[PDB]
Structure 1
Amino acid sequence: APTAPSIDMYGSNNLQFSKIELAMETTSGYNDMVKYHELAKIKVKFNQWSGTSGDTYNVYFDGVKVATGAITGSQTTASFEYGQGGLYQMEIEACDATGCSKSAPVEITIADTDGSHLKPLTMNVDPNNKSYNTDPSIVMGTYFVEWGIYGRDYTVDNMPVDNLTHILYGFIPICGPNESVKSVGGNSFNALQTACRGVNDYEVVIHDPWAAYQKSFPQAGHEYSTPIKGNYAMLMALKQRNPDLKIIPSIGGWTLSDPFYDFVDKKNRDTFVASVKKFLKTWKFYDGVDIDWEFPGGGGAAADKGDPVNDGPAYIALMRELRVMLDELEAETGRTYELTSAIGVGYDKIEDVDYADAVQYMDYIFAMTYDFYGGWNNVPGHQTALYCGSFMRPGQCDGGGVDENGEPYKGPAYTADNGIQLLLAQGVPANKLVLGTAMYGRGWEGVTPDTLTDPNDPMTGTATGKLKGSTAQGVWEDGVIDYKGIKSFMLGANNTGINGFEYGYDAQAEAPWVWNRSTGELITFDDHRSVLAKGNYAKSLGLAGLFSWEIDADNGDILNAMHEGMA
């Protein structure tokens, strides 16, 4: 018989609560911006302007009483703590001696980072991505990059999630020496320096909090009071849609690997592994960790780093220590966590680590079978070929020959099969190796016909510099072009070449190219045919599956081909 309470939406923060507290309007150090709590604090204001208010209130979630307290006149605040994320129908009841009266139910959101409060994400996928019935044992992975939401305009709801088993989210940085990030730009370095304020060196952080959790995506229903936004709330909603999908944070990559070279000291590995455990406890939708150190022994972005004696053993120790930590998380949560790594596949990278030893701790190695040639120099070659191409000289495939200046090759040529064969020769099990496909080309200009030593093969020519182009054509950085740009502006609908380009295919290498003889523009890439060849090779050798880099650059053709090739 008191008056039933009426809920004051606005003084109750629109009924948006959360276990994780996230700064939304400011940017500072990671430990200042992100605070995970075991209990969310819930504060709901209600009023009883007519009749009598009663003495006590009870708050119910789905019919279960979760809080109680005293009615305070015509407006009352119920404050309490709650440990379980979800969406609940809340009623508030007011009671006295003459009876109790309940409010109408209202939905309350209690966010947690497994997405338990979120409906399955609504997808917006290009319908060129087709449907397949691939064996669910086969890895079909891709990388999604955090910055793809800026000029590339490629968001989580654009991914063809039903054709993926693993999404690798690139990239999570490690606080410490990171001068290589300046090659991306000063704002990107500054973002990392801001994130690491108040954070110990060797701990992980989020590089761009705006893209990870602050930015409102209207396609995901985000609003002002949504407690978790950004890419991460979308990946939480994607996991609600596809609960068997593995989403794994990738630490490192080309510009973010400089801290790994300090892991020869165990104290820094210990700091790092602890920080990864804290990161996975904070962002519960992640299913493991991918380590992308480029590269133990050196040969990455920082020319002055790399210890070929001590980096391999440090890498193996890091994989052992990560697996010990992840087994602790499995015991605490009842979940399974995976440990993986993307690795270089030149002979010079593979010789610097004993992968037979490291891989006993790992679920998968993502073999980076791409970037063998590129616009960093003027030497054309197939960047992601399976086998040795027609352009290679006598003795170059195996490495016992000499170059066109008479200088001895130092090891086997850069092809995907030379790298796979060296990993298998070490003792790495085939069923843990995942072979890489490129969803982009690399390219040059100035490869004119008079530079070719073999006039049917422009990979025997010589370039004058990097491919240039607009972002409209998929050229975000000189020398690199998205596959979907190559298909729209170089291949055309018949795949034979448009806009002055002709398509070619090295049937021995398994490698496509497009060449404009007028501008000497040449691009090396992966296409439907080379990807089918990679699938056949993975089937033949019993590999774990395929992965691609990076998903925003595909128009569906490459992922469709990965499925067709593994069928």
Structure 2
Amino acid sequence: APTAPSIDMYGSNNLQFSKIELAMETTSGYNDMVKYHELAKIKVKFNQWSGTSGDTYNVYFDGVKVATGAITGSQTTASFEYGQGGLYQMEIEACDATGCSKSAPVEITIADTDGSHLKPLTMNVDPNNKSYNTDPSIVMGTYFVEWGIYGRDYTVDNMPVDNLTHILYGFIPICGPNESVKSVGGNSFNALQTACRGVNDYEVVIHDPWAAYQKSFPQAGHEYSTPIKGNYAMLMALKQRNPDLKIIPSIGGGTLSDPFYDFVDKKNRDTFVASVKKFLKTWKFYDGVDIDWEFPGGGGAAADKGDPVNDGPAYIALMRELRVMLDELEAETGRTYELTSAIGVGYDKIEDVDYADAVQYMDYIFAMTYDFYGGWNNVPGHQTALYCGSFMRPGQCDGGGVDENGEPYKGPAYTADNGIQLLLAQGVPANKLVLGTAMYGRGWEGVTPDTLTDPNDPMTGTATGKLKGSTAQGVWEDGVIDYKGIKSFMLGANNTGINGFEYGYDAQAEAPWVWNRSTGELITFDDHRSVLAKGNYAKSLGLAGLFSWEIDADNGDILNAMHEGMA
């Protein structure tokens, strides 16, 4: 008998292997960084120092032979391939003409992007998130942002996953024209430039490879030789804990929507749809695709883009073509894939798309019932109100009147109700519409009493500019503040108002605000009361459920109020 082999762990990459090859210590083009292989490459070194070595070796996973080769010395490197992810007990035997000698069993890791090699994720959720057993048929969605791991310090394990049915991962960019990303500043455009080097235009890529799969998270138990790290590995482990939880990549978003405007050319859609298929086969924890085109017809971040005649038909064509693609994946894997989309709900946004047509190919429409008003101008209003507010002029709500200048309104007011009603009027089934909840405030400064036409309602005032504040207060961008920040620094424990702020609620609109009279700071958001009204509203009309944006900005209260509202 030959000497029984002993596995060189550190010379065999600590027995950590993967079906997906990921660059861990660099930042380059997408095709250069991530290669998915049908068969994982296995390379194990074993030693036989004393005695005889034999002439042939055999490799066993869980007792089944998976490889064979030749031994020619006291050191042998066994290179072979295996196309199944998971954890296996490995034994290598050495053989001569008289017999074989098995090595001691040792656990080999073969990683795959479904997380079949991963234990369920250990949760670190804020206890303020309460337990609810809401009907499983109702959708409870949220957006988890890739960049939330940095300043916001919010990670996958922080999410209250038992209170969620859908998790939309934002955002997956598209290579090509992206001048809207540039004017945001920071590193976003640079990171996108890098990711798109050696990548065809109109293909999807990972924006932040560090956040996605590189960063070691100690809470997830990420070691040095771990083949998949970052948010993606944590989401893979999350699916092991919550197998029925839907995790869907959100493509586009506000600033990353520029390439969508070239989807009127079908070859650009073909390229996109195929890359999305490749992305889904590469990252198997994903359960579909969320399209966030902002907006068909224009009126978004790209001031020079938008085709009100062609974008709508292109959007519909895209949804059909994505469905066909997802049906292929459903056939190949035996899985259910979902097609969703987040959409603007203002009259002018909806009029450019026949959604009744588009929605036949889709599972859900995430009605972006927020951002009605904001810091982009000095006109106060409710950013995420259900109904028309007290501040509005006669004939503004339905759009049949005139403004203070005298010019007629071109359509109904920016409210949640108006958005939902216009979609139902088109022929969109209620059970496919998901109502949106804001986990953030939009703010102004300079809305002082002397600017109000109604002394009791600050929404009848005039601002000087965007709200300004620190990241410690939850202000990450001008005119935008986390809900958790509003609670801690504007509302206080009793919801009466602190630090010069006063709480107010428009009962007609179902919309709250906090207001500092001296600084003129005014913040419009969603609170417990307004989310209860939205929960009731969605239940009243038989909507699919509720979704939120964004999860990191919540302290628990908003999602709690979402479940309480649907009860």
Same fold (TM over 0.5): yes
Deviation at 1:516, TM superposition (A): 0.8
Q: Could you report, residue by residue, the CA deviation over 1:216-249 in whole angstroms, capped at 9, with x for unpaired residues? A: 1111111221111111111111111111111111
| d(CA) in 2 for partners of 1:88, 1:557 | 43
| d(CA) in 2 for partners of 1:196, 1:381 | 39
Q: Could you report, residue by residue, the CA deviation over 1:268-288 in whole angstroms, capped at 9, with x for unpaired residues? A: 111111111111111111110
Structure 1 equivalent of residue 430 of structure 2: 430
Deviation at 1:183, TM superposition (A): 2.4
| d(CA) in 2 for partners of 1:247, 1:383 | 27
Q: Could you report, residue by residue, the CA deviation over 1:101-149 in whole angstroms, capped at 9, with x for unpaired residues? A: 2222111111111111111111111111111100000010000111111
Deviation at 1:215, TM superposition (A): 1.3
Structure 1 equivalent of residue 236 of structure 2: 236
SS in 2 for 1:523: strand
| d(CA) in 1 for partners of 2:76, 2:129 | 54
CA contact (8 A) 1:370 1:437 kept: yes
Q: Could you report, residue by residue, the CA deviation over 1:437-488 in whole angstroms, capped at 9, with x for unpaired residues? A: 0000000111111111111111111111111111000000010000000001
536-545 or 119-128, which deviates more: 119-128
Structure 1 equivalent of residue 492 of structure 2: 492
348-357 or 221-230, which deviates more: 221-230
CA contact (8 A) 1:372 1:384 kept: yes
Structure 1 equivalent of residue 47 of structure 2: 47
SS in 1 for 2:387: coil
Structure 1 equivalent of residue 139 of structure 2: 139
Q: Could you report, residue by residue, the CA deviation over 1:386-435 in whole angstroms, capped at 9, with x for unpaired residues? A: 00011111111011111122121111000000000000000000000000
179-188 or 131-140, which deviates more: 179-188
Deviation at 1:69, TM superposition (A): 1.9
| d(CA) in 2 for partners of 1:193, 1:389 | 43
SS in 1 for 2:543: coil
SS in 2 for 1:471: coil
Deviation at 1:58, TM superposition (A): 1.6
Deviation at 1:89, TM superposition (A): 1.3
| d(CA) in 2 for partners of 1:350, 1:396 | 18
Shift in alpha-carbon separation, 1:435–1:218, aligned structure 2, 3 A: same
| d(CA) in 1 for partners of 2:170, 2:398 | 34
| d(CA) in 1 for partners of 2:494, 2:171 | 36
| d(CA) in 2 for partners of 1:101, 1:508 | 81
CA contact (8 A) 1:316 1:358 kept: yes
| d(CA) in 2 for partners of 1:127, 1:186 | 34
| d(CA) in 1 for partners of 2:564, 2:183 | 38
Deviation at 1:31, TM superposition (A): 0.8
| d(CA) in 2 for partners of 1:110, 1:5 | 21
Shift in alpha-carbon separation, 1:186–1:553, aligned structure 2, 3 A: closer
| d(CA) in 1 for partners of 2:89, 2:183 | 51
CA contact (8 A) 1:447 1:464 kept: yes
Deviation at 1:188, TM superposition (A): 1.1
SS in 2 for 1:399: coil
Structure 2 equivalent of residue 203 of structure 1: 203
| d(CA) in 1 for partners of 2:477, 2:337 | 35
Deviation at 1:184, TM superposition (A): 2.3
| d(CA) in 1 for partners of 2:265, 2:70 | 58
| d(CA) in 1 for partners of 2:14, 2:178 | 41
SS in 2 for 1:558: helix
Deviation at 1:186, TM superposition (A): 4.8
SS in 2 for 1:376: coil
SS in 2 for 1:59: strand
| d(CA) in 1 for partners of 2:106, 2:183 | 51
Q: 5+ residue gaps in structure 2?
A: none
CA contact (8 A) 1:13 1:225 kept: yes
CA contact (8 A) 1:213 1:232 kept: yes
| d(CA) in 2 for partners of 1:266, 1:42 | 41
| d(CA) in 2 for partners of 1:302, 1:68 | 59
1:341 aligns with 2:341: yes
Structure 1 equivalent of residue 564 of structure 2: 564
Deviation at 1:5, TM superposition (A): 1.4
| d(CA) in 2 for partners of 1:186, 1:543 | 39
| d(CA) in 2 for partners of 1:509, 1:561 | 18
Deviation at 1:100, TM superposition (A): 2.5
CA contact (8 A) 1:447 1:462 kept: yes
| d(CA) in 1 for partners of 2:185, 2:123 | 32
CA contact (8 A) 1:484 1:553 kept: yes
| d(CA) in 2 for partners of 1:478, 1:124 | 30
474-483 or 452-461, which deviates more: 452-461
Deviation at 1:56, TM superposition (A): 2.3
Structure 2 equivalent of residue 257 of structure 1: 257
Structure 1 equivalent of residue 97 of structure 2: 97
SS in 1 for 2:357: helix
SS in 2 for 1:546: strand
Q: Could you report, residue by residue, the CA deviation over 1:151-203 in whole angstroms, capped at 9, with x for unpaired residues? A: 11111111111111000001111111000001222521011111111111111
Q: Could you report, residue by residue, the CA deviation over 1:314-336 in whole angstroms, capped at 9, with x for unpaired residues? A: 11000011101111111111111
SS in 1 for 2:168: strand
SS in 1 for 2:130: coil
SS in 2 for 1:264: coil
SS in 2 for 1:157: helix
Deviation at 1:73, TM superposition (A): 2.5
TM-score by length of 2: 0.99
| d(CA) in 1 for partners of 2:398, 2:388 | 9
Deviation at 1:299, TM superposition (A): 0.4
Structure 2 equivalent of residue 161 of structure 1: 161
CA contact (8 A) 1:38 1:83 kept: yes
CA contact (8 A) 1:294 1:343 kept: yes
Deviation at 1:23, TM superposition (A): 1.0
Q: Could you report, residue by residue, the CA deviation over 1:294-345 in whole angstroms, capped at 9, with x for unpaired residues? A: 0000000011111101111111000011101111111111111000100000
| d(CA) in 2 for partners of 1:530, 1:541 | 17
Structure 2 equivalent of residue 192 of structure 1: 192
1:124 aligns with 2:124: yes
Deviation at 1:70, TM superposition (A): 2.2
| d(CA) in 2 for partners of 1:236, 1:106 | 24
The alignment yields a C-alpha RMSD, in angstroms, of 1.0
Q: Count matched residues.
A: 567
Q: 5+ residue gaps in structure 1?
A: none
CA contact (8 A) 1:183 1:255 kept: no
Deviation at 1:72, TM superposition (A): 2.7
| d(CA) in 2 for partners of 1:362, 1:548 | 19
CA contact (8 A) 1:12 1:43 kept: yes
| d(CA) in 1 for partners of 2:124, 2:449 | 44
| d(CA) in 1 for partners of 2:104, 2:470 | 56
SS in 2 for 1:268: helix
| d(CA) in 2 for partners of 1:290, 1:464 | 37
| d(CA) in 1 for partners of 2:298, 2:32 | 34
| d(CA) in 2 for partners of 1:93, 1:277 | 41
148-157 or 429-438, which deviates more: 148-157
SS in 2 for 1:472: coil
| d(CA) in 2 for partners of 1:14, 1:448 | 64
366-375 or 62-71, which deviates more: 62-71
TM-score by length of 1: 0.99
| d(CA) in 1 for partners of 2:365, 2:106 | 48
Deviation at 1:98, TM superposition (A): 3.8
| d(CA) in 2 for partners of 1:95, 1:496 | 80
Structure 1 equivalent of residue 377 of structure 2: 377
Deviation at 1:554, TM superposition (A): 0.3
Deviation at 1:95, TM superposition (A): 2.6
| d(CA) in 1 for partners of 2:392, 2:371 | 16
| d(CA) in 1 for partners of 2:198, 2:2 | 52
| d(CA) in 2 for partners of 1:332, 1:155 | 32
Deviation at 1:4, TM superposition (A): 1.9
Deviation at 1:208, TM superposition (A): 1.1
374-383 or 182-191, which deviates more: 182-191
Deviation at 1:2, TM superposition (A): 2.5
| d(CA) in 2 for partners of 1:325, 1:42 | 32
| d(CA) in 2 for partners of 1:186, 1:236 | 29
